């Protein structure tokens, strides 16, 4: 599913990732607009053989299981295909659990250099929450 920017900020707001450890709702709608461009289907893999999944772009070195990435955790308890999902929640809830771990959303790359330390709140204005 391709969301629209005010559709996916009402699914996370319902999800509680609103002000989720500090963050904003526009810091995770700045994320998947730059990670996946709103698409739950998105795949990228890296140079080290992992691969990167869904709207929050959600790595199988640390994160989940796709059955490819050797020595790799799965600290999400997850197959990566649920991450594809038109329903967020598996991507929600792990997204939880790594912005909990200490770097905060520094963990997603496009954020930390698309999204911080701008104007993240336009990423949500006009929309109906
Ligand atoms: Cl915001
Ligand atoms: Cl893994
Ligand atoms: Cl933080």
């Given at each position: 599913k391709v969301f629209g920017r005010c559709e996916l900020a009402a699914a996370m707001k319902r999800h509680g990732?609103?002000?989720?450890?500090?963050?904003?709702?526009g810091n995770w709608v700045c994320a998947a607009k730059f990670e996946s461009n709103f698409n739950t289907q998105a795949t990228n893999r890296n140079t080290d053989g992992s691969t990167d999944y869904g709207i929050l772009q959600i790595?199988?070195?640390?994160?989940?299981?796709?059955?490819?990435?050797?020595?790799?955790?799965n600290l999400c308890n997850i197959?990566?295909?649920?991450?594809?999902?038109?329903?967020?929640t598996a991507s929600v809830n792990c997204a939880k659990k790594i912005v909990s771990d200490g770097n905060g959303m520094n963990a997603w790359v496009a954020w930390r250099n698309?999204?911080?330390?701008?104007?993240?709140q336009a990423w949500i204005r006009g929309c109906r929450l």
């Open positions: 990732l609103d002000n989720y450890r500090g963050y904003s709702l790595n199988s070195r640390w994160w989940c299981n796709d059955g490819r990435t050797p020595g790799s955790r197959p990566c295909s649920a991450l594809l999902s038109s329903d967020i698309r999204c911080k330390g701008t104007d993240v």
